[PDB]
Design a protein around this ligand. Structure first.
Ligand SMILES: Cc1cc2nc3c(=O)[nH]c(=O)nc-3n(C[C@H](O)[C@H](O)[C@H](O)COP(=O)(O)OP(=O)(O)OC[C@H]3O[C@@H](n4cnc5c(N)ncnc54)[C@H](O)[C@@H]3O)c2cc1C
Ligand SMILES: Cc1cc2nc3c(=O)[nH]c(=O)nc-3n(C[C@H](O)[C@H](O)[C@H](O)COP(=O)(O)OP(=O)(O)OC[C@H]3O[C@@H](n4cnc5c(N)ncnc54)[C@H](O)[C@@H]3O)c2cc1C
Ligand code: SF4
Ligand code: SF4
Ligand code: SF4
Ligand code: SF4
Ligand code: SF4
Ligand code: SF4
Ligand code: SF4
Ligand code: SF4
Ligand code: SF4
Ligand code: SF4
Ligand code: SF4
Ligand code: SF4
Ligand code: SF4
Ligand SMILES: O=S(=O)(O)CCS
Ligand code: FES
Lengths: 183, 291, 137, 651, 148, 374
């Protein structure tokens, strides 16, 4: 039983506004053109091994089911862009899902491993930072012990911290600058 | 041909051999890979694009500026980084509202994007600019083995912004690997995802491994001796994932995993010690016995 | 400030494309004011130059696609005229960009819509054309 | 001095809702020469039209300006209105404030109003310099030309013929009947297609008032309504039609095997052939591209019909009206790669299936797999292939695909009740009389299954040749992966290959769907903006047979009007040379594609002179003329100059 | 203005009559032979490029002759002497801007015998100085009479 | 009128204006064919010119008489939403632009007789019978809307805010009794949430109509676009089974309705409508088949997209002309594929919706087609 009181009439608009200006109004507003044909669900490789149905995400969005933001289903999309490529209504499906995830993240629906990966780029400027074995491995091959990346360049590392703070990404992931850990 | 080489994360810090393979392979093809100093994470669209699109583009633009200040275009050996930097480039050039917001942020660090950088994938660069004929000319050790080609998803898709031909039936990598003497065996669902993408490997591991298990099964049934990819993320999924599948699902394939540059390295008479095949989670020795 | 753009459209194609966008409710900026003509072959440098004297910040000319002129070849004559005109404007200190000519069919309302958005923006960026002011001096 | 009347329309809320009409009407009064200005909800309506007529008399107006919809729609309407009031139709001017303003600036009302005001001023500015012109009364040649020998065209030709008008029917291929002839049965009656079309094809071939040119093409058309001079090319069959009997002995001995176009490639025909057994004219044709000239066919030909030294004759004809009925083609699905058309052997288009199901087909009515010739036990129908799809540029519904899929599923069931037929769809569109009932019957009586889901792709088993269909059962919220022996793509309708040639020859436009554009969807559905040229059938848009037939009759009615009157009014917006200003530079002469301006001697000096019959009023030579002697009535340079001024200031 | 024309105008005013100027364009007085089929231009040549034919029309030979956009009266001495008219007399009563019209005409006939396939970029690239070729004596009377 | 969204008057009014002053067309408005006799080419018809009680030649069509008249009669044209007077004109753009008196409601007081300038009012007017000889007859008596009172679960007739789409048309029309304002009949308020119910009286065996009315899908989306243009904030949901946008530009309109105007579509045939007797709002019970879950949404207005049924007088016309009916009760054409506007009865032709449920483009083509045939 789904009553009006359970639905959010602005959910669709909220997704569009979250998608403006990145990736853009015209891109995200494409969800409004979906005619629930199911080409996205049949194309989905994740749907072949889970309860995830790409078409229902768009449906829930258009109907106003906020629970979609709390669903684990949206995080099962690998972003292979196969649905995006085949949709006959030009729905920027993959892009819409990412934007939906942006709203989910703002609601506090983020995995720890994900927040950890985000923290390593904030702290060491990289998703997979170099370890003690990296230095030995790079040397043994015939490459610079330390690669010319932002990890070993404070200037670049600080530039990211400035941008992050301004963007509010630190607040989003719930990062405490003094402790250097998440909340 | 002069291009700023974007390393990324997985290749330089984990599978370093892929870098050493690329550097020497691109050097033999006549491409100057200039150092793109201070380059950070693309960032990974899987996590950042899903966490904050603004943060993904702002950071991606920052890395684009590095090559702009140098006055050169970017080249990479990763689909993830290619997709991220390519999409960032397209969007900043097309959408002015995104370019304004990004530059307003970049002003705080003394940077400004002008829309002059072009992002290229080393595979399409090799196919369109250099030519497949040049690959064959440098084959010192002709590799005669069957290969399970893995195009990935972020290389050709989205096709509307990439413009690298069809994504359903591509022949870009097939012609490149066959120039070394190998055979691109066609397997079921050749264009399906490895499962790692979109942050799935981290948040939903079991799910990603299920997708990889299928790909491996299809490749071995097609008669493949190894799997060649153009993405360190795919590489990790196909290599490290086999260990996870054996420890979890129970299936053991001992299927060798290689990157296109690493494969091209062996073809151009490179030393297997310099290709860092020992650090691989799955032994590459079985394949070395066939070549 | 809002640009003052003038358009000259052929009845059989661009005028019809401008109508199709109206029927389709294809929204676009309110700067342009279209003048109907039977053929783009009617357009000539005097009309475009006259419009700039009058105060046009931008001038748009729409005709049939090359090979589809309802009058067979009027667009080829216009095409030859507009190329000289672009350079004449440069010599007169008027930016090439202030003048824009496109081939839009009676069904191409979506193109017309976009052409209008893109043209307004170009003119908006360039700012007002300061000819009329300099002559009234 | 000009006494202009300005009338701002609201078109209900279409204009009023965005453009503050009362305010434009107040502004209109401030402009020079405007002695009256009103605003009415519907100007084209009775009270609107009488308002203008009453005011022209009561205020002695010599000009009128209507600020409303596009003139491409109601220019004639108002011209007729003001003509009845005594005012010349060319002293009337139209301001486009709806499509060109209100309908495109809905969220910018203040600017929309200001823009409407400019357009009224602009129009008013031109109107001041307008001159009274006399409509050219031209005779109508009592003859009609129909292009395309399909069900649509045969209908038009037969109705005009029955009405007593000489008519010419031109058909590209060697036989009339068109696509219909390729169908086996026709929904919703499941009537044998050919069986009901044949008598019409037979009637039109022996009609006293209809001249038929089969295996012929209209290569050049010149003129205007009532005075069209057409040139038809009677293609060389390389066989004497008067001597041929259509026995078909020649084909049994021909060694060359050419793929049958009628059979969509599924069948093989000979160099010498007949499209289908019920073909009209019942004559044969030799395809010179593949004929080796061995002379084996001549040996078995009794009446000496063959002639390899044949010249394709050109016939000149004068007609009054032309009706276009070229029809349509099927969508090539090779682009939708996931479906595998062109790669997988057992993935066929529905038009191919029609030819397979047809008794007179290359398989003798047998639905067989092209991989092994076996009968498929499980068949999948995929809907909307090449339709309702932006990725292939076709954002339209092909109208019949739903209905023909179910129809062909019923036929497979009649022939083989045990067959499993699944139809993958989005919306079953059975909108006409008996269609829904046909849909109900398909599921209830024939046991045809329907899956609501647009397939994501098709994957062939390279071992058996069978096809797996991947899709989502949206009514279950689960993903299906069913196996089939044959996959039928319900390909949509796209314009025929030659449409681009015809469009250029006739000079007609195309709609966003690429089909031919009607004058107005509801005001004039078979007419075109180009007077004298009409449309009929699928070339106008994707439709079924009943609809095409109605259009053929409708078009004949419309085309019968000028022919019945015998006289029509043509616009006098033509070019003329001022003999006092022209010095005979010769610039104008070659600009005209119709050769209207010619140099002549007058009063001892050389001067250009336009031949009024040859000018179609384009406006290229007056524009090209450097002496200003050449001017186009109603589009004179001074009138356009005043119009440019009108945007910026009053004059 | 030629002397006789100056006398005619003054003479008319003295008599009390209204002076009337010639209305045709220069080709009328011009003695050069015109093609009956009309004018057709292939390539635009500069006044130094070549040695013109003394009989054929200079515009048809590829020289920018303003006689077509210029009021008659002078007797066309320039083409009669071997050079194109530079439009010293200005336009006719029906033409406000001489240069604009001269261009319109020049573009229209350029490559007319190959109308559909002639390159439209040949003409602007050929003429390096457009203003000085068409607005020699009338720039101030033009719609755009200055360079901004 | 879809798909162009032109005004209906735009296309209609000029054709009305033209036919009223056509030299070859004699028009008998407010009249009926009472008897037809003969055969093809030799038909002898009798038309009854009804008494308007107003001289046609003398009437100017000003309408001063209407404001003075005391009796207020419900307007048939407005479908019972608006009221008219004993002396009247169906709509402002009506043709002929003349007035008519209804003696069943007129009390014959004689008040409007004093305000009538030209002495048009003639109470002793006899309805004249005109004899005429014709060769061919074309039937175009059109259609009527389905009365949904039978589908009890929807509550039409019981609930105040459950209207038919034809009523909505009169409500939305600028020249309507509400002045283009979509309002609730319970309190006159503007509905913030509207629900459109499709296939009402169509594709339904329980009401004997197993056919598709053809235009229901299209007009629902159309009127939803109009409500949005007038009031963008409004929530419009369309409960459907199959969106049937099949002709030229139709699907594009469907795409545009969702993409541009934000009209929502629920694939599910509603089970019932239940009014809240407290607020007057309506709850729509249905299943979202694309989700496999049951919905119970609240609305301020419920629009029934009523189907097409033959007009009341069709039985009389059937007998007079001697023509047959199809299973859907509309007039039967000669052949469903080759003679679509002819009848088995030679000389008698059909045109428009009386032949079957269709749109204006189709009805206009049939009119031309029938004229060709006739
Ligand atoms: C697979 C399939 C199944 C269908 N099934 C049905 C059905 O069951 N029932 C139904 O009602 N409808 C059906 N249709 C639709 C039906 O085919 C059309 O409604 C019908 O063909 C329209 O008639 P037409 O004459 O206008 O077009 P066409 O049949 O295509 O005929 C046009 C004619 O013009 C000729 N022509 C083409 N170019 C030129 C030229 N340049 N000059 C001169 N002549 C030219 C052609 O050769 C052809 O003879 C089906 C369509 C398809 C694709
Ligand atoms: C709510 C709604 C919305 C619609 N929207 C659209 C749309 O947006 N676009 C579109 O194209 N179509 C639309 N339609 C369809 C449209 O109404 C019909 O296509 C069209 O009105 C049919 O015209 P007709 O002449 O065939 O029938 P009608 O319009 O009904 O005309 C029948 C005429 O015959 C007269 N008549 C009846 N009986 C007799 C008799 N015994 N003697 C004399 N005269 C008689 C009647 O008074 C009437 O004037 C809509 C329909 C409805 C109900
Ligand atoms: S494909 Fe595009 S349209 Fe079909 S469902 Fe997935 S989203 Fe809506
Ligand atoms: S993208 Fe996300 S959704 Fe679209 S297919 Fe790949 S996974 Fe399924
Ligand atoms: S050609 Fe000679 S043989 Fe072939 S059919 Fe006509 S007659 Fe029989
Ligand atoms: S000639 Fe020889 S080849 Fe050409 S057709 Fe008659 S038989 Fe077949
Ligand atoms: S008709 Fe049926 S199938 Fe053919 S397009 Fe419209 S919907 Fe898709
Ligand atoms: S072009 Fe103008 S001038 Fe040269 S001739 Fe033709 S008309 Fe007389
Ligand atoms: S106007 Fe167009 S048509 Fe009339 S003459 Fe000059 S060129 Fe030939
Ligand atoms: S030369 Fe110049 S002037 Fe003499 S005729 Fe040829 S063009 Fe006219
Ligand atoms: S230049 Fe002055 S003089 Fe020489 S021709 Fe042209 S006009 Fe007569
Ligand atoms: S048609 Fe032109 S005039 Fe008749 S109403 Fe709609 S807008 Fe006003
Ligand atoms: S008043 Fe007399 S005239 Fe004026 S309308 Fe009512 S009736 Fe016709
Ligand atoms: S008389 Fe009959 S009509 Fe005249 S007013 Fe009283 S009621 Fe209305
Ligand atoms: S049209 Fe759409 S709504 Fe009306 S009946 Fe046919 S299906 Fe039901
Ligand atoms: O999308 S992810 O950045 O997580 C993987 C690279 S293809
Ligand atoms: S009619 Fe449009 S360019 Fe000639």
């Amino acid at each position: 039983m789904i009553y009006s009181s359970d639905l959010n009439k602005n959910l669709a608009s909220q997704i569009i506004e979250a998608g403006t200006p990145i990736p853009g109004d015209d891109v995200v507003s494409s969800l409004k053109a979906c005619y629930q044909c199911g080409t996205c669900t049949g194309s989905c490789p994740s749907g072949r091994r889970t309860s995830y149905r790409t078409r229902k995400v768009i449906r829930k969005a258009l109907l106003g089911m906020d629970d979609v933001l709390d669903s684990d289903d949206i995080w099962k999309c690998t972003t292979c862009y196969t649905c995006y490529e085949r949709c006959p209504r030009d729905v920027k499906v993959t892009e819409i899902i990412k934007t939906i995830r942006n709203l989910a993240a703002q609601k506090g629906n983020m995995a720890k491993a994900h927040k950890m990966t985000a923290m390593y780029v904030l702290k060491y400027g990289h998703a997979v930072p170099a370890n003690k074995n990296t230095a030995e491995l790079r040397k043994s091959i015939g490459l610079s012990e330390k690669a010319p990346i932002a990890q070993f360049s404070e200037k670049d590392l600080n530039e990211m911290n400035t941008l992050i703070k301004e963007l509010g990404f630190d607040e989003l992931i719930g990062f405490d600058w003094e402790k250097g850990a998440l909340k | 041909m002069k291009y700023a080489f974007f390393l990324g994360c997985i290749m330089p810090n984990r599978y370093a051999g892929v870098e050493a393979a690329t550097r020497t392979v691109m050097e033999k093809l006549g491409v100057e890979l200039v150092d793109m100093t201070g380059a950070s994470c693309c960032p990974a669209p899987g996590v950042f694009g899903s966490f904050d699109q603004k943060t993904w583009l702002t950071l991606a633009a920052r890395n684009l500026c590095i090559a702009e200040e140098m006055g050169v275009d970017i080249v990479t050996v990763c689909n993830g980084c290619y997709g991220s930097l390519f999409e960032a480039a397209h969007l900043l050039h097309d959408n002015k509202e995104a370019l304004n917001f990004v530059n307003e942020k970049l002003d705080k660090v003394g940077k400004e994007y002008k829309g002059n950088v072009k992002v290229r994938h080393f595979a399409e660069l090799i196919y369109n600019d250099i030519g497949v004929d040049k690959i064959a000319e440098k084959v010192e050790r002709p590799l005669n083995i069957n290969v399970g080609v893995h195009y990935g998803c972020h290389f050709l898709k989205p096709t509307d912004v990439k413009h690298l031909g069809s994504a359903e039936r591509p022949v870009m990598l097939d012609e490149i690997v066959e120039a070394t003497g190998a055979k691109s065996v066609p397997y079921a669902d050749k264009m399906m995802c490895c499962g790692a993408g979109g942050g799935v490997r981290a948040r939903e591991l079991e799910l990603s491994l299920d997708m990889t298990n299928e790909k491996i099964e299809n490749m071995i049934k097609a008669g493949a001796d190894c799997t060649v990819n153009v993405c360190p993320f795919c590489h990790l999924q196909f290599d490290r994932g086999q260990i996870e599948i054996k420890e979890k699902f129970g299936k053991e394939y001992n299927f060798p995993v290689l990157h296109l540059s690493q494969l091209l390295g062996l073809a151009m008479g490179m030393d297997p010690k310099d290709l860092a095949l020992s650090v691989h989670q799955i032994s590459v020795d079985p394949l070395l016995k066939k070549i | 400030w809002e640009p003052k753009i003038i358009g000259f459209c052929c009845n059989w194609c661009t005028y019809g494309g401008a109508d199709t966008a109206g029927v389709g409710r294809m929204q676009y900026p309110p700067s342009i004011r279209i003048i109907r003509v039977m053929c783009s072959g009617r357009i000539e440098p005097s009309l475009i130059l006259k419009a700039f004297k009058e105060g046009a910040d931008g001038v748009f000319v729409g005709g049939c696609h090359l090979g589809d002129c309802h009058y067979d070849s009027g667009n080829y004559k216009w095409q030859r005229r507009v190329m000289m005109l672009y350079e004449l404007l440069e010599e007169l200190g008027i930016e090439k960009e202030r003048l824009n000519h496109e081939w839009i069919s009676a069904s191409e309302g979506e193109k017309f819509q976009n052409t209008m958005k893109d043209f307004y923006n170009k003119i908006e960026a360039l700012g007002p054309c300061k000819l009329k002011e300099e002559l009234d001096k | 001095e000009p006494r202009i009347g300005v009338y701002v329309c609201h078109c209900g809320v279409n204009i009023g809702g965005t453009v503050d009409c009362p305010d434009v009407t107040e502004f209109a009064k401030t402009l020079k020469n405007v002695v009256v200005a009103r605003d009415y909800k519907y100007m084209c309506a009775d009270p609107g039209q009488e308002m203008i007529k009453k005011d022209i008399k009561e205020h002695n107006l010599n000009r009128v300006v209507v600020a409303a919809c596009s003139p491409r729609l109601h220019e004639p309407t108002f011209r007729r209105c003001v003509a009845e009031a005594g005012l010349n139709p060319f002293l009337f001017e139209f301001a486009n404030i709806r499509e060109h303003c209100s309908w495109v600036h809905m969220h910018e009302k203040e600017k929309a109003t200001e823009k409407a005001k400019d357009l009224v001023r602009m129009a008013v500015a031109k109107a001041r310099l307008l001159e009274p012109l006399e409509f050219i009364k031209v005779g109508v040649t009592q003859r009609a030309l129909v292009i395309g020998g399909g069900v649509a065209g045969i209908q038009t030709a037969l109705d005009l013929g029955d009405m007593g008008f000489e008519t010419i029917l031109v058909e590209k291929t060697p036989s009339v009947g068109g696509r219909m002839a390729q169908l086996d049965k026709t929904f919703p009656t499941n009537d044998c297609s050919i069986c009901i079309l044949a008598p019409k094809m037979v009637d039109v071939a022996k009609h006293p008032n209809v001249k038929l040119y089969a295996y012929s093409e209209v290569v050049d058309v010149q003129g205007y309504v009532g005075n069209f001079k057409v040139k038809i090319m009677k293609k060389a069959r390389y066989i004497d039609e008067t001597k041929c009997t259509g026995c078909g002995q020649c084909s049994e001995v021909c060694p060359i095997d050419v793929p049958n176009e009628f059979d969509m490639g599924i069948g093989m025909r000979k160099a010498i052939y007949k499209p289908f057994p019920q073909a009209v004219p019942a004559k044969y044709t030799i395809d010179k591209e593949h004929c080796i000239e061995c002379g084996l066919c001549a040996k078995v030909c009794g009446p000496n019909a063959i002639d390899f030294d044949q010249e394709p004759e050109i016939i000149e004809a004068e007609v009054g009206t032309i009706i276009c009925a070229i029809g349509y083609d099927a969508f090539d699905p090779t682009v939708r790669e996931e479906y595998g058309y062109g790669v997988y052997d057992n993935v066929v288009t529905a038009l191919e299936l029609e030819r397979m199901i047809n008794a007179s087909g290359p398989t003798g009515g047998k639905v067989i797999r092209l991989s092994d010739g076996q009968k498929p036990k499980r068949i999948a129908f995929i809907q909307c292939v090449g339709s309702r799809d932006a990725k292939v540029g076709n954002k339209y519904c092909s109208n019949v695909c739903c209905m023909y899929a179910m129809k062909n599923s019923q036929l497979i069931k009649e022939k083989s009740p045990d067959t499993e037929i699944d139809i993958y769809y989005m919306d079953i569109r059975a909108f006409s009389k008996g269609y829904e009932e046909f849909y109900e019957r398909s599921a209830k009586q024939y046991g045809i299954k329907f899956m609501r889901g647009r397939p994501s792709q098709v994957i062939e088993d390279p071992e058996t040749g069978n096809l797996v269909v991947r899709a989502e059962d949206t009514l279950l919220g689960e993903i299906l992966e069913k196996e089939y022996d044959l996959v039928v793509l319900s390909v949509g309708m796209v314009p025929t290959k030659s449409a681009d040639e015809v469009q250029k020859i006739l000079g007609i436009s195309r709609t966003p769907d690429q089909f031919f554009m009607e004058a107005h969807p509801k005001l004039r559905p078979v007419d075109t903006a180009t007077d004298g040229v009409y449309l009929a059938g699928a070339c106008q848009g994707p439709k079924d047979i009943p609809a095409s037939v109605a259009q053929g009759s409708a078009a004949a009615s419309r085309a019968a009007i000028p022919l019945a009157k015998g006289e029509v009014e043509v616009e006098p917006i033509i070019a003329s040379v001022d003999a006092e200003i022209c010095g005979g530079c010769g610039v104008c002469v070659k600009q005209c594609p119709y050769g209207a301006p010619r140099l002549v001697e007058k009063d001892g000096k050389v001067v250009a002179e336009v031949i009024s019959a040859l000018c179609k009023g384009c406006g290229t030579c007056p524009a090209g003329c450097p002496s200003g002697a050449l001017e186009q009535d109603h589009f004179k340079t001074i009138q356009l100059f005043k119009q440019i001024e009108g945007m910026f200031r009053d004059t | 203005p030629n002397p006789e024309m100056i006398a005619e105008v003054v003479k008319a005013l003295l008599e009390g009559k209204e002076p009337e100027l010639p209305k045709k364009n220069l080709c009328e007085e011009c003695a050069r032979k015109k093609s009956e089929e009309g004018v057709a231009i292939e390539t635009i040549k500069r006044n130094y490029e070549g040695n013109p034919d003394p009989e054929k029309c200079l515009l048809e030979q590829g020289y920018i002759c303003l006689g077509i956009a210029t009021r008659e009266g002078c007797g066309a001495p320039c083409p009669s002497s071997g050079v194109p008219c530079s439009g010293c007399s200005g336009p006719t009563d029906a033409v406000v801007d001489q240069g604009a019209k001269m261009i319109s005409a020049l573009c229209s006939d350029f490559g007319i015998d190959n109308d559909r396939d002639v390159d439209p970029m040949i003409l602007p690239k050929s003429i390096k100085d457009k203003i000085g070729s068409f607005y020699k004596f009338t720039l101030p009377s033009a719609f755009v009479p200055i360079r901004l």
